[PDB]
Amino acid sequence: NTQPVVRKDGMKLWGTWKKQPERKLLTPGEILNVFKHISPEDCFRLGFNEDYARPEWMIITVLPVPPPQVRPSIAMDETTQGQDDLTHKLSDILKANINVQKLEMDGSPQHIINEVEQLLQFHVATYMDNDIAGQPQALQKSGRPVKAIRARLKGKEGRLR
Amino acid sequence: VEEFEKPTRATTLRLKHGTYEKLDEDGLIAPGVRVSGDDIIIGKTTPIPHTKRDASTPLRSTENGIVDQVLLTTNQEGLKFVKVRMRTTK
Amino acid sequence: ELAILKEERTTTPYLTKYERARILGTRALQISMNAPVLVDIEGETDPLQIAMKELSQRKIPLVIRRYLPDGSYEDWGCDELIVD
Amino acid sequence: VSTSTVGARRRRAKQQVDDEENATLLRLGPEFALKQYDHDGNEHDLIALSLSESRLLIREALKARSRARNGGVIDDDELAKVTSGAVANGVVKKTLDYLNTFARFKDEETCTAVDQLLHLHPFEIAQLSSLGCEDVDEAITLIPSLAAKKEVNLQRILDELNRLEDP
Amino acid sequence: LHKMSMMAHRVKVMPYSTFRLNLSVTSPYNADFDGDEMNLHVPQSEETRAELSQLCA
Amino acid sequence: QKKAMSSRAGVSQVLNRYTYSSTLSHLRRTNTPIGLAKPRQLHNTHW
Amino acid sequence: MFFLKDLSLILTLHPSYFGPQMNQYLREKLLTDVEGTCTGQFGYIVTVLDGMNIDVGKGRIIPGSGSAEFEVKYRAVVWKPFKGEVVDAIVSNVSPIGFFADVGPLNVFVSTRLIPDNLVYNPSNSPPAYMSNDELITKGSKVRLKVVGTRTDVNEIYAIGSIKEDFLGAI
Amino acid sequence: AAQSIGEPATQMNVTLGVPRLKEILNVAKNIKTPALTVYLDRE
Amino acid sequence: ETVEILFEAGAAAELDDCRGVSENVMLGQLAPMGTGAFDVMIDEKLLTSL
Amino acid sequence: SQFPYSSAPLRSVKEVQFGLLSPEEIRAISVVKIEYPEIMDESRQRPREGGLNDPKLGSIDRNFKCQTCGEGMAECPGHFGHMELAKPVFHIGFIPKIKKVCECICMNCGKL
Amino acid sequence: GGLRFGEMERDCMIAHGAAGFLKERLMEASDAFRVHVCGICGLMSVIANLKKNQFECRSCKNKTNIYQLHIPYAAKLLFQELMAMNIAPRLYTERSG
DNA sequence: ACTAGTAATAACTACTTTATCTTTTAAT
DNA sequence: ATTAAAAGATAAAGTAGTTGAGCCTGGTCATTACTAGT
RNA sequence: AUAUAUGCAUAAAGACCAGGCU
Ligand SMILES: [Mg+2]
Ligand SMILES: [Zn+2]
Ligand SMILES: [Zn+2]
């Protein structure tokens, strides 16, 4: 067959096939299925590790949930206990996931599925990295930007330094 | 609503380790009383949703002085509003 | 395998400042933990002073394992390293 | 608490199914595999001690401990009293009481003869010199190791075990 | 800026609330007495006490 | 309140009451929202 | 059952014992802390051999504590149960719900389901026993069993045996 | 060595000073004041 | 570039030998520098010679 | 030396191995599945079972100990959970590199 | 509050050669913590119960090859965050070579 | 027939990348 | 013999990181239109 | 057969913003 040309647009991979050409969206499922077929020798020769760093693990299909020690419970005023930015972001991600499931079991207005999936992908990305260039960052409820793990790690006031 | 009163261990929880004997029956310390650090100057208790817990503001840990003035008034909402001014010599 | 024979040691026979400080600290801690003393105690009460007195008389029972960059090591007794 | 020479075996991407132990399939686990490592790391065969051989080695170790402690001076109770510690003493008397009654060859000359006669998985020689065998059918029924060898000759070896060794 | 900005000293307990310094150690510390604040750390072990006494003195 | 960012900050400040001269100086203060040493110099036109 | 193993132990020595007799003290610690113990990977430890002149090596001074760490390598004899291995034992207690047997320090329990139906428990016998036609199992009688399960609690091993096969029973 | 080199930098027609030190350290492909010193023959 | 380096290390399955000083500091160990550039043994021979 | 005694031997880290967490490993290390958006049941303490603050995840207060390790907040290091996603999601830190892989292997047979 | 031992102080201690003082300042005078690791996965997923002395690793079904380490609490938090970001930093106490 | 919870509403320097160019080669 | 095809050199343009240490003080931490209790 | 429970003697807000200190 003829390979396509892959371009990056925000958090999307646009694949154009030169046949006029045809431009389509590279869904994570298809890319993960393609990656799962890579032979161990080809994985080794691609700079990846068969035992430690497999390419298809680069696509997220299950999300780890850190213990409350990573996201300690906060109390805005005395008895009332608030939640950290990570807690709210995980709650929003889980709400998006259950929305995806509950709308998938229902009818399929494909555009709605596409936009809900894009919203879920945006939420996951802002959970991992809220400093994505080219698009507006996710705002917290109070209006301040969401403090992601990337912001916690880097910086002079970050974790390492 | 919160209450300005002298708290006791029999009806209030989460009391501070400071001195509560310098307060009056209204939870406010009289002016002209020499006070040291880590002492309660305003006594406020708040009910829980031992039905009350302590929310009293103490003196600064590394600060001493004499209570100079005590002001009591009402805010916009309609509840109590207290300001305690303490004076010391450097 | 990784050890180096006594007749093939090429490191300096002197005691470095870092080695001296480490031995003094270890000996002081051991003396403070009720260890036998190999020298007489006349009037000194500080374990650091006792360790220094032991070092001056070359009686500290410790061995320095100097590590070569490759991984091999040389074992030097504290009684054979020259102390300035 | 204690550790052996065999270690490492860190996590891999693909899990291994053959992990459980079963003597019928002659699987002994990674700790007691066919090849072990000595002090210098050289490959060595697995050492299996039969009850007579175990009796001889325990008696030798206890007499060596007596030489080390008392200094140049017979009974199971005495050997149990040689060591110290309530748990260790109880364990040693229990194992001596189990071993002396069930030791097939309790004398050194017969032990040397068995050495020679014995002279193949070490579990097989251990089980042949450990538990009594009188018939080929019962020998293969008790443990299936003798059932499938393709060089069996159980008649002559069992005749030796019954006549040359202790019946 | 350099290793001379952090050195091991011997404690002398004195009244009043200011650290006292010899005038000859101001230049390596790059400090004057117009309101400078300086920090002190106390070792909590014999080995680190010996390290401070024999290396950073 | 919604647009916390992309807005000038520090326009209004708490008045200084350490002394009379400090209060007057605070009441007669100007600032430039530039946050390059060219604008920091004392120009001749500042006379 | 009885195996020969190569073991290594890490021993911590306090600075208070830094004397000329420290080798013997380390040997005493090894003798105390090896024999009579049990481990999951190795099983019950019977004893150690040639422990009078074992090589203790050179100590490791732990930074900040001053204690010495010694890695002692030794050759010992141990005892480890095996799945499916038949063994001779002497029984201790006999109950309708099952009976126990002793193999060295190990206690192997045989449940009533694992005795053939010919043998029947009888409390009236003195001592209480499992009897059948020309078959007798009292307390302290030699029996043959087959281990059909092993489980470890770090400190001890627990095993279950069955006598539901041919050429297995009292001898 | 790093401290002994950075310490004088606090105290302190070709480019000289802190800009020149930064230009050297960064290995700039473009030089603010490029120059060549050419020596001639003895005669 | 802490997060970028960490992500690249995770993707490339790099191994850290912990021979430098920074990773010894962040792990709270004795760095192999100065007084930590060696190990101190026990002199069995001299103690026995007593 | 203020930590409680543990029978596990104490040593120091000598090698750090980096890599990616496989979904099987993520499911294995987890102790609870998180699926309920809500936090409280009816606002009388007792957080939702399987929620974002499940007691099996860890303990942060002295009133309740950890239900997985059994120790208090001073010793419990925290325990991870897993959440299943309906659809696969790209990793923001791995957006370009995956594309590079897309320029190396085929999109049908998955071969270089 | 507590005074800050910044990066320049660490550099000065490195120049001085006092490794033990730096170690005690950054561990004993700060957030020291004890963690448990598994000798197979190398990950910090070991469930430990010191009251009844039970150590277990769910993933590798391990109960014996488990070690304990003394690390800064900030290092523990960093490793947990890396695990949360689908990165697996495995701490091994032996060199594979 | 009214009320209050309540939830949703920066330049400097560098690297990398892309398209342009074009020279190159074998084909007209 | 001469020029269409084109693989590849590379010139030009778009994109992206990152900024000296610590210390102190004070201030803030939304908002309002939809729908259920008595 | 006990007898109700009608009870609790310290919990650690953190993140941003602004103004100063050498
Ligand atoms: Mg000054
Ligand atoms: Zn726990
Ligand atoms: Zn594991």
Distance K41 CA to ligand 3 centre (A): 4
Any strand N atom closer than 7 Å to A139 CB: no
- Give the CA-trace dihedral at E9, E13, E17, E23, to 10 degrees: -40
DSSP E strands in chain J: the ranges are 15-17, 81-89
For chain I, list residues whose CB is within 8 angstroms of any CB belonging to chain A.
Answer: 1-3, 6, 10-13, 26
Q: Which residues pair with G136 in a beta bridge?
A: G131
Token pair of J109 as six digits: 């047979």
**How far is Cα K82 from Cα K86, in angstroms, rounded to an integer?**
7
SS3 per-residue string spanning D69-131: HCCCCCCHHHHHHHCCCHHHHHHHHHHHHHHHHHCCCCCHHHHHHHHHHHCCCHHHHHHHCCC
CA closest to N11 C1', residue: B14
For K26, the closest of I17, I25, I36 (CB atoms) is: I25
Residues in chain E: 57
Fold of D49-167: Growth Hormone; Chain: A; (1.20.1250)
Q: Which CATH number fits domain K1-85: 3.20.20.150, 3.90.1800.10, 3.40.50.300, 3.40.50.460?
A: 3.90.1800.10
Residues in chain I: 50
Q: What are phi and psi of B18, to 5 degrees?
A: -80, -175
CA C34 to chain centre: 18
CB contacts, 8 Å: A77 with chain B = none
What DSSP string runs through H23-42?
Answer: HHHHT-SS-SS-----PPP-
Token pair of D141 as six digits: 């029924």
Rg (alpha carbons) of chain A, rounded to whole number: 19
Q: Which residues pair with G74 in a beta bridge?
A: G7
| Bridging pattern class, strands A5-9 and A12-17 | antiparallel
What DSSP string runs through K35-86?
Answer: EEEETTT-SS-EEEETTTTEEEETTTTBSSSEEEEEEEHHHHHHHHHHHHTT
**How far is Cα C81 from Cα C68, in angstroms, rounded to an integer?**
18
**How far is Cα G116 from Cα G101, in angstroms, rounded to an integer?**
17
CA E48 to chain centre: 15
In the three-class reduction of DSSP (H, G, I as helix; E, B as strand; rest coil), residue G15 is classed as helix
| Contact (CB, 8 A) for F31 and F10 | yes
Nucleotides of N under 7 A from a protein CB: 7-19, 21-22
| Contact (CB, 8 A) for G68 and C29 | no
Apex J89 CA angle, J83 and J95, nearest 5: 135
Q: Tell me the C-alpha to C-alpha distance, in Å, between residue C16 and each of C13, G164, I20.
A: 9, 74, 22
For G42, the closest of D31, D88, D102 (CB atoms) is: D31
Each residue of C1-38: b (16+ CB within 10 Å) or e?
eeeeeeeeeeeeeebbebbbbbbbbbbbbbbbbebeeb
Chain-chain contact of K90 with J21 (C-beta, under 8 angstroms): no
The answer to whether residue H19 neighbours chain E at the CB level (below 8 Å) is: no
Closest listed residue to residue G143, CA positions, set G63, G88, G100: G88
Distance F25 CA to ligand 3 centre (A): 67
Closest listed residue to residue A150, CA positions, set B21, A137, I25: A137
Residue found by looking up tokens 């002492």 in the block: B39
Rg (alpha carbons) of chain C, rounded to whole number: 14
Q: Determine if residue I43 is left, alpha or beta; phi over 0 gives left, psi from -120 to 50 gives alpha, anything else beta.
A: beta
- Give the CA-trace dihedral at G13, G15, G21, G24, to 10 degrees: -10
**How far is Cα J12 from Cα K17, in angstroms, rounded to an integer?**
21
Give the nucleotide at minimum CA-to-C1' distance from H23: L13
Distance G164 CA to ligand 3 centre (A): 38
Give the distance, in angstroms, between residue A16 CA and nucleotide L23 C1': 30
Q: Which residues pair with I7 in a beta bridge?
A: none
Residue found by looking up tokens 């925000």 in the block: A10
| Contact (CB, 8 A) for E19 and E40 | yes
Closest listed residue to residue K51, CA positions, set J78, J6, J8: J6
Residues in chain J: 112
Domains and CATH numbers, chain G: 1-82 (3.30.1490.120), 83-171 (2.40.50.140)
Residue found by looking up tokens 């113990």 in the block: G37
> Which ligand ends up closest to the CA of K56?
3
Q: How many helices (H) and strands (E) does chain C have?
A: 2, 2
**How far is Cα A24 from Cα A32, in angstroms, rounded to an integer?**
16
The answer to whether residue G137 neighbours chain I at the CB level (below 8 Å) is: no
**How far is Cα A75 from Cα I5, in angstroms, rounded to an integer?**
35
Residue of A nearest to D13 (CA): A51
Each residue of J1-25: b (16+ CB within 10 Å) or e?
eeeeebebeeebbbbbbbbbbbbeb
Chain-chain contact of A79 with B48 (C-beta, under 8 angstroms): yes
In the three-class reduction of DSSP (H, G, I as helix; E, B as strand; rest coil), residue H26 is classed as helix
The residue extents of the domains of chain D are 1-48, 49-167
Q: Tell me the C-alpha to C-alpha distance, in Å, between residue C63 and each of B75, I40, K84.
A: 76, 6, 45
K12 is in an annotated binding site: no
Residues in chain C: 84
Closest listed residue to residue G78, CA positions, set G49, G112, G108: G49
CB contacts, 8 Å: C61 with chain I = 42-43, 46-47
Closest listed residue to residue J30, CA positions, set J64, J68, J87: J68
Q: Roughly how many angstroms between the first and final C-alpha of chain E, as a whole number?
A: 18
The residue extents of the domains of chain K are 1-85
| Contact (CB, 8 A) for G36 and D87 | yes
| Contact (CB, 8 A) for A83 and A73 | yes
Architecture of domain C1-84 in CATH? Alpha-Beta Complex (3.90)
Neighbouring CB atoms inside 10 A of I5's CB total: 11
Please, which residues have CB within 8 angstroms of residue H19's CB and are 6 or more apart in sequence?
A: H32
- Give the CA-trace dihedral at G163, G164, G165, G167, to 10 degrees: 40
**How far is Cα I37 from Cα G74, in angstroms, rounded to an integer?**
31
> How far off is chain K from A78, nearest CA to CA, in Å?
22
Chain-chain contact of I14 with J97 (C-beta, under 8 angstroms): no
Strand order in the sheet with A22-25: A5-9, A12-17, A22-25
The residue extents of the domains of chain C are 1-84
| Contact (CB, 8 A) for K89 and K76 | no
Q: Tell me the C-alpha to C-alpha distance, in Å, between residue C49 and each of C43, C78, C82, E46.
A: 10, 17, 19, 12
Q: Tell me the C-alpha to C-alpha distance, in Å, between residue B43 and each of B10, B40, G77, G86.
A: 15, 7, 74, 80
Q: What are phi and psi of A42, to 5 degrees?
A: -65, -35
* K 19-48 → E contacts, CB under 8 A: 20-21, 24-25, 28-29
Longest dimension (CA), chain A: 66
Q: Tell me the C-alpha to C-alpha distance, in Å, between residue A76 and each of A79, F2, J54.
A: 8, 21, 21
A145 cis-preceded (ω within 30 degrees of 0): no
Q: Tell me the C-alpha to C-alpha distance, in Å, between residue E16 and each of D154, F25, G35.
A: 99, 36, 65
Give the distance, in angstroms, between residue A71 CA and nucleotide L8 C1': 25
> How far off is chain J from K8, nearest CA to CA, in Å?
25
**How far is Cα D123 from Cα G82, in angstroms, rounded to an integer?**
11
Distance K60 CA to ligand 3 centre (A): 4
Which technique? cryo-EM
Domains and CATH numbers, chain I: 1-36 (1.10.150.390)
If residue I44 lies in a helix (H) or strand (E), which one and from where to where? helix I44-49
| Contact (CB, 8 A) for G142 and G88 | yes
Give the distance, in angstroms, between residue J46 CA and nucleotide N3 C1': 30
**How far is Cα G80 from Cα G2, in angstroms, rounded to an integer?**
7
Q: Tell me the C-alpha to C-alpha distance, in Å, between residue K16 and each of E11, E56, I30.
A: 20, 6, 14
**How far is Cα K28 from Cα E44, in angstroms, rounded to an integer?**
9
CA F45 to chain centre: 19
Token pair of G83 as six digits: 């799945």
**How far is Cα I25 from Cα B21, in angstroms, rounded to an integer?**
50
